[PDB]
Amino acid sequence: FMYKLVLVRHGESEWNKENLFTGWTDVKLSDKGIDEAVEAGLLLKQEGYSFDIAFSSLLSRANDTLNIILRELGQSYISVKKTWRLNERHYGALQGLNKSETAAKYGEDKVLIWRRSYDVPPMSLDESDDRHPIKDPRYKHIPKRELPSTECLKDTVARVIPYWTDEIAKEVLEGKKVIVAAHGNSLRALVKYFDNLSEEDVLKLNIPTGIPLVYELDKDLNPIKHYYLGDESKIKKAMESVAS
Amino acid sequence: FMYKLVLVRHGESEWNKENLFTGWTDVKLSDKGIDEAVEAGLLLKQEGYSFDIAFSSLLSRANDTLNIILRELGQSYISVKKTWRLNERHYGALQGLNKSETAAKYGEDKVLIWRRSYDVPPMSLDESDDRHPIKDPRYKHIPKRELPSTECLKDTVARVIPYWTDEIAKEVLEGKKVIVAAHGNSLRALVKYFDNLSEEDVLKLNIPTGIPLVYELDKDLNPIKHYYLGDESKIKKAMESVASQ
């Protein structure tokens, strides 16, 4: 191989217990989440990984995960860049609700379509809703028309990949060692891209929280292989938790 | 006023107990240091401070302090920029030694000159020494000739101010709310600049660890006033601790 890229999904948040749709809601890591980040950092150290540049989203839980990892590596001084383009998928008007409140409000049929679809977004937020991204000043540098009121996975993939093209790939091609600390659906977008997954396969992909995913890439950034770091049992446990 | 700039010095490191000269040595914060950062963040939150951009050094202890502060503010997503120009003063061949080892090795006279001088650096590191910055890959983007083998305070000031000019001041002038999390001597450089301190006064300036220092600035970035945040007693205790080191 020529290059290594490391991807990591943040751990449990304060809303995973009640199983709320999170999306762009800026919720904090839980203490379990914090501990998962510590272990992901210890794992990277044990395996000899170090980095020159780090990327994350504009959401706290990803950034806190990244900071904990870099601290464990003794690399809290490296260049860090953040972008909305690595944000979790926007879940529209589902944000803040549990699955049963969602069924009750939008109906069993529409909820079944939304869960199984690649390209049908859930009900959108109105711009007047307090949850809408336009009301958060961290997004004021982004034209309002491009801030999502909702996303299907297809929308998420379409706004992730340009960041891969313009920033992440650029750094890899300059020989920098990159880590990306992001979210389930934004990492799904990247895995779909690298391994040319079908819509069906990306919808069933369950990326384990807190386990580094390493891609080995050739001179042209085609994947040679990938693998999660650490023991098969830790990975299985984390993968079942994401499924269930 | 027109603008507010916030400066903060990191808290205790793992070498402050034994009182070792640290400089560019990349030592970690102690648990007391971590706690000082937590309190500095809680203090800023209590007082309604928020930020658009943050600056720090290339040293872990400053960056860890900054990350802790931003986490307490719920602002771990903001833009952060790091530069060697905000590094602590380089202490040359004193790095890793205590005061008595330094006296014994270099003598009482030279140690007295070094402590009182603005412009006489301590004994320099050879490029072959393991402590020399050229051996650390975090500095590989900097021409070797500009990486210090030692610094006097005058050298430190001379390499801090350009970062103020090119980056920090630029952001302040664009209306961004800036925080700088750095070190004793790099902040001394900035205080010397803002308040036009004499060489004597900057040498006696004790910036307390972990207490935010706020400058109110006019349209042209001239200081109107400054103040530390929080209770007089926390400040006094922190200032006496710095006098002690």
Q: Inter-chain contact A74–B60, Cβ cutoff 8 Å? A: yes
Interior CA angle at A64 toward A49 and B207, to 5°?
100
In A32-69, which positions are buried (b, 16+ CB within 10 angstroms) versus exposed (e)?
Answer: ebbebbbbbbebbeeeebebbbbbbbbbbbbbbbbbbb
Question: A71 to chain B: which residues are within 8 Å by CB?
Answer: 60, 64, 67
Inter-residue contact A54 to A179 (CB < 8 Å): yes
Question: B57 to chain A: which residues are within 8 Å by CB?
Answer: 77
Question: A63 to chain B: which residues are within 8 Å by CB?
Answer: 76-77
Q: Which CATH number fits domain B1-245: 3.40.50.1240, 3.30.565.10, 3.30.10.20, 3.100.10.10?
A: 3.40.50.1240
Q: Inter-chain contact A57–B74, Cβ cutoff 8 Å? A: no
Residue A15, C-beta contacts closer than 8 angstroms, at least 6 positions apart: A22, A25, A27
E runs forming strands in chain A: 3-9, 53-56, 79-82, 178-182, 213-217, 223-228
A115 marked as binding residue: yes
Instruction: For strands B79-82 and B53-56, give the pairing.
Output: parallel
Residue tagged active-site, from A36, A72, A88, A171: A88
A127 marked as binding residue: no
Q: How many CB atoms lie within 10 A of CB A215?
A: 22
Of the candidates B26, B64, B76, the beta carbon closest to that of A60 is on B76
Experimental technique used to determine this entry: X-ray
What CATH fold (topology level) applies to the domain A1-244? Rossmann fold (3.40.50)
* Cα dihedral sign, B118-B123-B127-B129: negative
CA distance B227 to B48: 15
- What is the SS3 assignment for A53? strand
**How far lies A163's CA from each of A156, B13, B116, in Å?**
12, 37, 52
Q: Which residues, listed in sequence order, are joined to residue B182 by a DSSP beta bridge? A: B9
Q: Which residues, listed in sequence order, are joined to residue A7 by a DSSP beta bridge? A: A180, A213
- What is the SS3 assignment for B181? strand
**Tokens linked to A41:** 């950092």
**Nearest residue to A1 via CA among A226, A197, A189:** A226
Kindly list the residues of chain B whose beta carbon comes within 8 Å of any beta carbon in chain A.
Answer: 26, 56-60, 63-64, 67, 71, 74, 76-80, 82, 138
CA distance B7 to chain A (A): 18
Interior CA angle at A158 toward A16 and A65, to 5°?
35
Q: How many CB atoms lie within 10 A of CB A117?
A: 15
Q: Inter-chain contact B77–A67, Cβ cutoff 8 Å? A: no
The H or E element that residue A72 is part of is helix A60-72
Of the candidates A71, A77, A79, the beta carbon closest to that of B59 is on A77
Would you call A39 a catalytic residue per the annotation? Answer: no
CA distance A77 to chain B (A): 5
**Tokens linked to A194:** 């690298």
Q: State which amino acid sits at residue B173.
A: L
CA distance B5 to B96: 33
Inter-residue contact B184 to B22 (CB < 8 Å): no
**What distance lies between CA A91 and its chain's CA centroid?**
14
Phi then psi for B212, rounded to 5 degrees?
-65, 140
Of the candidates B74, B79, B138, the beta carbon closest to that of A77 is on B138
Question: B82 to chain A: which residues are within 8 Å by CB?
Answer: 77-79
Question: A78 to chain B: which residues are within 8 Å by CB?
Answer: 82, 138
CA distance B12 to B188: 17
Interior CA angle at B135 toward B131 and B140, to 5°?
135
Residue A68, C-beta contacts closer than 8 angstroms, at least 6 positions apart: A34, A37, A38, A40, A41
E runs forming strands in B58-192: 79-82, 178-182
In A177-211, which positions are buried (b, 16+ CB within 10 angstroms) versus exposed (e)?
Answer: bbbbbbbbbbbbbbbbbbeeeeeeebeebebbbbb
CA distance B38 to B10: 11
Q: List active site positions of B.
A: 10, 88
Can you tell me which residue has the tokens 């001239």?
B222
Phi then psi for A241, rounded to 5 degrees?
-65, -40
Chain A residue whose CA is closest to B28: A74
DSSP one-letter code for B245:
-
CA distance A185 to A62: 13
Chain A residue whose CA is closest to B141: A52
The H or E element that residue B223 is part of is strand B223-228
B151 burial level (CB within 10 Å; 0-12, 13-18, 19+): buried
A206 marked as binding residue: no
